[PDB]
Amino acid sequence: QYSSNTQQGRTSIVHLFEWRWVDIALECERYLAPKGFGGVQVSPPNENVAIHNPFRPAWERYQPVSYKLCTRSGNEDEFRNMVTRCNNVGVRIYVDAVINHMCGNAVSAGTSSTCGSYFNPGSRDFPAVPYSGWDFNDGKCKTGSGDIENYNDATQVRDCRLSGLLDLALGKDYVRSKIAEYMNHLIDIGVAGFRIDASKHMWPGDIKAILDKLHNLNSNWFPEGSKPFIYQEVIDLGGEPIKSSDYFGNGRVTEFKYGAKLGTVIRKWNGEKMSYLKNWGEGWGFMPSDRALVFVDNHDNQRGHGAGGASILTFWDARLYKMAVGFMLAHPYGFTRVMSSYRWPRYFENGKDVNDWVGPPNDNGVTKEVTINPDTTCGNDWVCEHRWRQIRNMVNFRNVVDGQPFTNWYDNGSNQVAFGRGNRGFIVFNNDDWTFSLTLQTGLPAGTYCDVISGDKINGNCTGIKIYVSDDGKAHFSISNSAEDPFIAIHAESKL
Ligand SMILES: C[C@H]1O[C@H](O[C@H]2[C@H](O)[C@@H](O)[C@@H](O)O[C@@H]2CO)[C@H](O)[C@@H](O)[C@@H]1N[C@H]1C=C(CO)[C@@H](O)[C@H](O)[C@H]1O
Ligand SMILES: OC[C@H]1O[C@H](O)[C@H](O)[C@@H](O)[C@@H]1O
Ligand SMILES: [Ca+2]
Ligand SMILES: [Cl-]
């Protein structure tokens, strides 16, 4: 469950949040494969409640109606088409698996669902599965409301309804088997692994019992005995009875400490400075690197949901965001996930984004296609951070330096830092209010290297900055504090 199952020399996954299957399939072929992306985390592919108030929110996808592969992202044919086409170009699919719960207990009965399946939350009837009243935790939960009231109580966090979401009885073999059926369907199609949604809300032992029932990965694409990559969503910043480590037996775990702390550092809040990143990783109290799924922001905290707080960096803060993502992708700690977002009409009323619910770009609820602008950015309000040169090139930086040790660290005691990865890559940051101008040991072979932040190598030349490494590995770097991208990165494959 710990191995990503990505192609050798591909080290990141990108969350193509709310993208349609046909768009992802094309994206794999035209972009993700040639740019060296390891894989795609997709939005939940299973049927959900069509919520009309508010109008088709992002969060409707986290209210299951059945396990039919039928969503705003597309139908089963399109899903199968996407996984095949992506695997065929060496790009993996990871499914957002919503298995803790069905929909909200107060959602109306009917066929307001993405495939038109009937469901009745009040009577606990989901006949397209099927689930009945016997399949939920109503009798197991011990709170007055039936919902989670207190995170200091590990039991109710597991047995009670998250925000009123009907809590599946995962202690039952029937329920475990229905979920395993869904996941095995996905595995056989060719899915490489799963983001396990709301993992904190399930007993580690129940997740395990579900995982016990799963097939090995599709043997046309994956070596015999390959197990699905598992990464579990557990928000653990400390101070709760449930710990990220409780889930290590099942796979990797999201390290939410990662983006919270990095955001604070890059913003220079709370007295934090980039020089403090010298011991980034386990030295910052983070989980073991071999279990961490790391990211700057995710689909929840980029809009203030879940954990996060104000420190989280997102596309809205493009300049600091790129630096934070650049730092993540250069540093060996964790397995990296890059966010890919859509723009929504962000509108604050007393410190709250009243539009944090808004779903993907749409015309009357129909998800808009991802259009590609001439310059390879996206139209239709898709942000496509993964296509921003500064991020895409850092994705390849991580591939190039894979397995190389953190080395040649420099800092000025403030916010000017640099480090290398073995003899394969070097990166330099200026987050101070003055110019960073200095000759530094890069650990790299002598030569002319294209800075992959400002530009690209195109056979024999660079479209941006050029860095000159002399015979002793030293190179001069000059980064103004006024630089729009106040960092530079060079690696073995950017050498002329
Ligand atoms: C959105 C988020 O809610 C929960 O998170 C809480 C943390 O667990 C607490 O430690 C504390 O920080 O408060 C948080 C906010 O309530 C929950 O535990 C997470 O699992 C949840 N995230 C996902 C689950 C969903 C339900 O399917 C979705 O709404 C959401 O998009 C998921 O990413
Ligand atoms: O500002 C606080 C920091 O000061 C010190 O320089 C330590 O290296 C670091 O661990 C500590 O957190
Ligand atoms: Ca539960
Ligand atoms: Cl997540």
Curated annotation (Swiss-Prot):
Residues glycosylated per entry: 412, 461
Keyword Ribonucleoprotein: no
Protein name (database record): Alpha-amylase 1A
Entry keywords, A to Z: Calcium, Carbohydrate metabolism, Chloride, Disulfide bond, Glycoprotein, Glycosidase, Hydrolase, Metal-binding, Pyrrolidone carboxylic acid, Secreted, Signal
A GO term, aspect molecular function: chloride ion binding
Quaternary state and interactors: Monomer.
Primary location recorded for the protein, binned into one broad class: secreted
Disulfides per UniProt: 28-86, 70-115, 141-160, 378-384, 450-462
Its biological purpose: Calcium-binding enzyme that initiates starch digestion in the oral cavity. Catalyzes the hydrolysis of internal (1->4)-alpha-D-glucosidic bonds, yielding a mixture of maltose, isomaltose, small amounts of glucose as well as small linear and branched oligosaccharides called dextrins.
Protein's cellular compartments: Secreted
Chemical reaction(s) catalysed: Endohydrolysis of (1->4)-alpha-D-glucosidic linkages in polysaccharides containing three or more (1->4)-alpha-linked D-glucose units
Family (UniProt): Belongs to the glycosyl hydrolase 13 family.
EC number per UniProt: 3.2.1.1
Pfam families: Alpha-amylase, Alpha-amylase_C
InterPro entries: A-amylase/branching_C (IPR006048), A-amylase_C (IPR031319), Alpha_amylase (IPR006046), Glyco_hydro_13_cat_dom (IPR006047), Glyco_hydro_b (IPR013780), Glycoside_hydrolase_SF (IPR017853)
Gene that this sequence comes from: AMY1A
Residues given in the record as chloride binding sites: 195, 298, 337
